[PDB]
Amino acid sequence: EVTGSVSLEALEEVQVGENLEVGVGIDELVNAEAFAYDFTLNYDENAFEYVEAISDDGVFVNAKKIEDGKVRVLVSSLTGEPLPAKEVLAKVVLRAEAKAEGSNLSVTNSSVGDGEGLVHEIAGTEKTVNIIE
């Protein structure tokens, strides 16, 4: 029985014209190891625009916008070792475009693949961010 959960970190407040790097990882994964990770970041397009997705060199990242406010991200290990937990694996770069209070950032539709190609769902998470003038 596999369980797990997403990690999500970002600044709590940014100003219009400033980037917000939204760091996504795996908080916990029980009874499986993950060599790849598929998740969707949801945000308010009235508040932010999507710029790109970035990663540090032990991980390969590709992302594609699905619709305004919705970006799908794929993360895979380049190390020959599973993706570690408790580390930012990918950062989704948003850019603040307009003031907003309690703007929601949520990770949904999150799953991992193991070395044998088996897929497991993991629980999403959410946090809020303010955009000031």
């Binding site: 060599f35 790849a36 598929d38 794929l74 895979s76 020959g80 693949g113 193991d114």
Partner: protein, 131 residues
């Protein structure tokens, strides 16, 4: 007699004329066209006049036929990259490539048939999933 050797050379050139390299279904993996070109040129050398023996001509036909087979094997199909063979390409398939990075023994995961599993396969699977 070089008729059949010339016919195989023309088959190869036709494959080149008609093919494009890329990540999409119906395209060929990066490098496929270069590889076939090297082999067509080998065959062309034997084809070109002089005192090529019937065994030289036969070896050339054999090698070029193998090259044509290799080229065709590099065609991207609907199911290319669906490794567990469960009818779709997803994060499990990407995970299999990742776990097997550096493998020289996984000759079903080696999509571009270059002898190892590396960032090519990673890039291919990422592209197919998202597009």
């Amino acid at each position: 007699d070089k008729t059949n050797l010339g016919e195989l050379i023309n088959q190869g050139k036709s494959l080149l004329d008609e093919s494009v390299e890329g990540f999409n279904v119906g395209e060929y993996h990066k490098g496929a066209k270069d590889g076939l070109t090297v082999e067509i040129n080998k065959a062309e050398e034997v084809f070109n006049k002089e005192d090529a023996t019937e065994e030289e001509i036969n070896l050339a036909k054999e090698s070029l036929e193998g090259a044509i087979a290799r080229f065709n094997s590099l065609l991207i199909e609907e199911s290319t990259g669906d490794f567990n063979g469960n009818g779709k390409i997803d994060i499990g398939d990407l995970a299999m490539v990742s776990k097997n990075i550096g493998s020289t023994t996984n000759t079903s995961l080696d999509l571009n048939k270059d002898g190892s599993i590396d960032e090519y396969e990673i890039s291919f699977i990422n592209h197919r999933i998202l597009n």
